[PDB]
């Protein structure tokens, strides 16, 4: 009876950060209460000035990470403000039936609507906009995000021990195929309307034009790189929603990866890298042992370096010389 | 000593649907005799009336599933028969030795050969045609098929319990690569001979042209749409010879699933969507929880949408708003 | 206190080839040295004549495949020679901290340096040039091997029991990305820095033109296939810097497979074809029970057969009739 359970309101904060919430379950199963207005918005996402119509969860590509425990209900206000041109929805790949909640969301622009679904299954998962024959176009222009839930018990490494950690982010990966002219520059649009046939031949090449996290080439950079201190546990959710990747973190590892994002099963240990399928959230957890700059990347490096996918820790703290040390600087 | 075995044989059946078979063998270890005639032929693979010349076993893409159990010997009769024009032979993933089987059963046009093995490693597993210098041509052609292996005492979860499925399907991943003129218009040939150099330069492009599911879009929809009940167990085994894929199940999920096909290694559980790599077969377990319509799809979703890679189920049964309900219907 | 530990100097050797090693370790911790001199040549890497400028380690594609055990140090000192023209670095991901030793190897043609670090993690791992806005060049232009990390105790089984190989062999696939001109012919240049802009715009296609084992076409072929014997345990390592990989014995099988390449996870069995992620290496365990030609293949069969990601493996011995016969001849 759904009406005797505690209802708790939690607002979302921007990709790459994440909400508040409890490792471990402090209370019984709850009914958790999110909003999301959705925000169609002209996007720069390259340095050159590249512009697209983005079509957004909260106003971020990716959309912002939302995080419950297992068999805790999820109840989601949609709103698709009159601001807005096209009819919009969501399907949450961590809910069963009627197409994760697609079927029943379909909010045309000065609607609203709420959904709840029992989560069910522990893991990460993908969530994504998917109207009836649009649904590439809507996923690819930036409506996409993820969920994550958790065990009431939280995080188990693969001898069923406690994992904590310290920190959380999460990396939305975004393949964009923006429309070319015969020379090979990128068209503009006044209305995302206006690029729909344009933007159906783009995606049928099938080669992304850009790759890139938290919505823009350099996100995760500067004064927006990711921080943490040597000694830190930290945990890293990465989606795409459309297209394979293999994060990596340079100069560092996976040390418990869940590669398709999925609690029950045990993590693998000591990664490189690892392959998460498009459609997929996946979870990584690293204690950082060294400081410095490093590198998050799909390590398809031409993804990374050419088209964006690349973003960076800024990690302070005391470097250990038996782990890694110069012996002879270069010299002639 | 084979002869005093027993010998069984059996009809296969058109994909998707699976030949008759005992999960766990009510049987000591048989010859089970399969007979397979190759069947070049005119295929139109979309609703624009694109018609490649298909190289199939027995008249589909895919060819058929095999069920047998491990330590079972598969007989197999290939006949080539002189209506058709090329060479072709069978590559037994599941076999040990010879190519597959590639090297003992190359036959011309007006010929036949009987080809046994052993089943030594239980799994689900592909089998493709690949003669001599034109091995990927024939291939995404179209043939192509899988063969599963049960282990003796049927499937078992990750704790080594059985698990039994009430309904098995088989859904054959095929990507085509038509070749296209100047402008970008598919091509057209009289015999399959005609298109080889043209095909080539189609294939080395790695990019398909169409996606799809049990040889055409739209394959498995409308009347052909995969049905179950709420309750059922359904296992679906999927093959992809040659290029990548991600299945998913729109609504919901993969319970207990083999990604990369083989049975003495525990299911990941709770999949969202999995990696199928090419040239191998996987499966996965499902019960369904909720009726309606569900689309099963490779989750690049330009792949699934634009290029043909998707299906659907239809489940007949009794809605749990517990799962999910929508709690105000989308609404000004 | 390193200085009192042994210190013991290896001498590389071709892939793909390794260099002698124990695998239950003989002695306690050492600091393990090696010399690494860079290389740019001419390579010409298919059958037509097509020649690049390739960057290399130690004179090869792939660079020589090192072997240490866990809780080593690896000493590597790195010369670049003043007939080079480039800039280069090393980034290992088997090491923790400075980008995998990147930021600290930078060497101009003239100058050397030497690096140390610990091997905390087994498995094997990627190693590549990686210099500052160069990153996917250097690579892709044949600047990346693998380092192996074994267990001091050796490789282990599913069940925790000891796995022995009789032979090793090292992999590198690469995927070259040669400019074309108009017509889709392939360009040459006098010096590696003649191409830069070009080679850009190739990998921004993110369609190689030559997936190469061992540095060209059929590089693993004819007098320099692999070899074995019926009986033999053969482990395979193979790398992929920058692009997913599907490899497959053709006739065979991956009995235990780390695909992922990590050696505290247990192994996947009986694989017919696994996936190894771009930026990984993995290694692959066979016993081999029938004589002939095998063929190892990248199972995107275009990739294999027609870009060039082939091998053969030739194998001596008794044929078993029970595994594999043909028990009528292809006839009329
Ligand atoms: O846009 N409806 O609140
Ligand atoms: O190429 N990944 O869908
Ligand atoms: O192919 N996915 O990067
Ligand atoms: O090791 N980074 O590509
Ligand atoms: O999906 N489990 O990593
Ligand atoms: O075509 N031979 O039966
Ligand atoms: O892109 N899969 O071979
Ligand atoms: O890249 N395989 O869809
Ligand atoms: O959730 N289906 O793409
Ligand atoms: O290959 N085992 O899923
Ligand atoms: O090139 N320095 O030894
Ligand atoms: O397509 N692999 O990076
Ligand atoms: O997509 N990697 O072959
Ligand atoms: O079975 N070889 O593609
Ligand atoms: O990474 N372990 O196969
Ligand atoms: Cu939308
Ligand atoms: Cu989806
Ligand atoms: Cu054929
Ligand atoms: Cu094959
Ligand atoms: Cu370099
Ligand atoms: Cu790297």
Same mark, same amino acid.
């Not at 919505?215 to 004064?223: E, I, N, Q, S, Y």
């Given at each position: 009876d759904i009406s005797t359970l505690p209802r708790v309101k939690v607002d979302l904060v921007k990709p790459p950060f994440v909400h508040a919430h409890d490792?471990?379950?402090?209370? #019984?199963?709850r009914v958790v209460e999110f909003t999301m207005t959705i925000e169609e918005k002209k996007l720069v996402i390259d340095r050159e000035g590249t512009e697209i119509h983005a079509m957004t969860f909260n106003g971020s590509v990716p959309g912002p990470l939302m995080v419950v425990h297992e068999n805790d209900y999820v109840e989601l206000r949609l709103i698709n403000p009159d601001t807005n041109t096209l009819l919009h929805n969501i399907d949450f790949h961590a809910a069963t039936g009627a197409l994760g909640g697609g079927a029943l969301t379909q909010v045309n622009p000065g609607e609203e609507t709420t959904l709840r679904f029992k989560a069910t299954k522990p893991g990460v998962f993908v969530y994504h906009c998917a109207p009836e024959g649009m649904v590439p176009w809507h996923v690819t222009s930036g409506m996409n995000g993820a969920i994550m839930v958790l065990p009431r018990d939280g995080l188990k490494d693969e001898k069923g021990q406690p994992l904590t950690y310290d920190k959380i982010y999460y990396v939305g990966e975004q393949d964009f195929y923006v429309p070319k002219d015969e020379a090979g520059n990128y068209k503009k649009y006044?209305?995302? !309307?206006? /690029?729909y046939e344009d933007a159906v031949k783009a995606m049928r090449?099938?080669?992304?034009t850009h790759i890139v996290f938290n #919505? /823009?080439? !350099? /996100?995760?950079? !500067? %004064?927006h790189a990711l921080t943490a201190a040597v000694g830190e546990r930290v945990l890293v959710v990465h989606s795409q929603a459309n297209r394979d990747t293999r994060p990596h973190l340079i100069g560092g590892? !996976? %040390?418990?990866?869940?590669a398709t994002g999925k609690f029950r099963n045990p993590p693998d240990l000591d990664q490189e890298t690892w392959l998460i399928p498009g459609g997929t959230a996946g979870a990584a957890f690293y204690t950082f042992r060294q400081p410095g700059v490093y590198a998050y990347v799909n390590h398809n490096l031409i993804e990374a370096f050419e088209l964006g996918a690349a973003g960076h820790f800024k990690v302070t703290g005391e470097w250990n010389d038996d782990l890694m040390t110069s012996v002879v600087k270069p010299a002639s």
């Open positions: 490792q471990v379950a402090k209370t #019984g199963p006044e209305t995302p !309307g206006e /690029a090449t099938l080669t992304p #919505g /823009a080439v !350099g /996100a995760l950079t !500067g %004064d590892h !996976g %040390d418990y990866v869940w």
